[PDB]
Structure 1
Amino acid sequence: NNLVETTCKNTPNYQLCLKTLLSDKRSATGDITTLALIMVDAIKAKANQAAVTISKLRHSNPPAAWKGPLKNCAFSYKVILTASLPEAIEALTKGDPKFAEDGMVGSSGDAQECEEYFKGSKSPFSALNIAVHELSDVGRAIVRNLL
């Protein structure tokens, strides 16, 4: 709480860090490594739901325009969920920060690149790409205190 506020001040989105951490029961007691894992779980929750939305979009006769971007975005979310986030969870739980930052750098890039494919058109799940990107950015900054 004291630590939560201070932790969140050292991030590029103070309000998103705080709304995210204060909404999880683990933040009251948790040390900063716990705050890091709470963020990673929030990125994961949004990434899982983007993956679901993409699948639903691709199998329901999608506009020809969305077909490339959705294909590509499906893969980006596969990388976030089965590589980047598990690694960052590995590194916080049993390793060292450094690699968590790598996984948060990755997931932030992948979520933006997915959004970028819709540029010049209407983007079907913008709030979810932006949330994954911004949560990952907050996450990056938290792990970057640890170093």
Structure 2
Amino acid sequence: NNLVETTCKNTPNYQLCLKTLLSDKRSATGDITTLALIMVDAIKAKANQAAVTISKLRHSNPPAAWKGPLKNCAFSYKVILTASLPEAIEALTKGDPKFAEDGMVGSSGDAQECEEYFKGSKSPFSALNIAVHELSDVGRAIVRNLL
């Protein structure tokens, strides 16, 4: 059965998609909706890590120049974690997958927005914003099969 291979081939980042899916035990037997949920959980895990990292930097006497960007970044991730991803999960499990695409698009956009709040569009946690964004683009691609 090459469902995971077939699904990741239809994404912009095959290696990221494989590693993410093959890492969750639900993949070997799940359907496409289940693989989509596995991807949303990976996005949630990285977004939660970015959120806590932002919080830690705001509480570590950051420079004055990072005060506004870190606060706006905090709002970006509050949106990802309290709205976009919960909304996607609901669409995938109890609704129309059509709606999960919008949440993936939203999370890709919100992760990039945070990075861009910093001077030179360069934050002190780039790898986390990049990962949320890339996992979100993989998730959006997987959801489009469904609809």
**TM surpasses 0.5:** yes
How many residues get paired?
A: 147
**How far apart in 2 are the matches of 1:87 and 1:121?**
28
**How far apart in 2 are the matches of 1:63 and 1:50?**
19
Match of 1:72 in 2: 72
CA gap of 1:121–1:108, structure 2 versus 1, over 3 A, is closer
Q: CA deviation at 1:121?
A: 6.6
Please identify, of 3-12 and 120-129, the stretch whose mean Cα deviation from structure 2 is larger: 120-129
Match of 1:81 in 2: 81
**How far apart in 2 are the matches of 1:124 and 1:49?**
14
CA gap of 1:27–1:126, structure 2 versus 1, over 3 A, is same
CA root-mean-square deviation = 1.0
Q: CA deviation at 1:56?
A: 0.4
For the residue of structure 2 that corresponds to 1:127, the secondary structure is: helix
Q: CA deviation at 1:68?
A: 1.1
Match of 1:101 in 2: 101
TM-score, normalization by structure 1: 0.97
Moved over 2 A (4+): none
Please identify, of 57-66 and 118-127, the stretch whose mean Cα deviation from structure 2 is larger: 118-127
Aligned 8 A contact 2:112 2:129 in 1: yes
**How far apart in 2 are the matches of 1:121 and 1:134?**
17
Q: CA deviation at 1:119?
A: 4.1
Q: Runs of 5+ in structure 1 lacking a partner?
A: none
**How far apart in 2 are the matches of 1:99 and 1:69?**
29
Q: Percent identity?
A: 100
CA gap of 1:121–1:81, structure 2 versus 1, over 3 A, is closer
Q: Runs of 5+ in structure 2 lacking a partner?
A: none
Q: CA deviation at 1:120?
A: 1.6
CA gap of 1:73–1:40, structure 2 versus 1, over 3 A, is same
CA gap of 1:121–1:90, structure 2 versus 1, over 3 A, is closer
1:30-49 to structure 2, matched below 5 A, reads 30-49=30-49
TM-score, normalization by structure 2: 0.97
